[PDB]
Symmetry: none
C-alpha cells in the first residue's frame, strides 16, 4: 500500500507591511 503522508511544507512568506502610524 501507499507510504505515509509527507511532512508539512515550509512556512509561508512574511506578511505585507503594516499601515502608517498616526500623524505627528
Amino acid at each position: 500500500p501507499p507510504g505515509p503522508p509527507g511532512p508539512p511544507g515550509p512556512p509561508g512568506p512574511p506578511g505585507p507591511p503594516g499601515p502608517p502610524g498616526p500623524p505627528g
Copy 2:
C-alpha cells in the same frame, strides 16, 4: 507507491512595521 504530499506549512511571520505617520 509513495504517500500523499504533506499538509501546507504554517503561516509566515508578520510583515514589517509600517512607516511613520504624517507630520502634525
Copy 3:
C-alpha cells in the same frame, strides 16, 4: 511493505500585516 513517504507539503500562507508605524514627526 508500504511505500516511501510522500513529499513535503506546499508552502503555508503569507503571514498577517505588520504593526502600524510610529507617530509622525
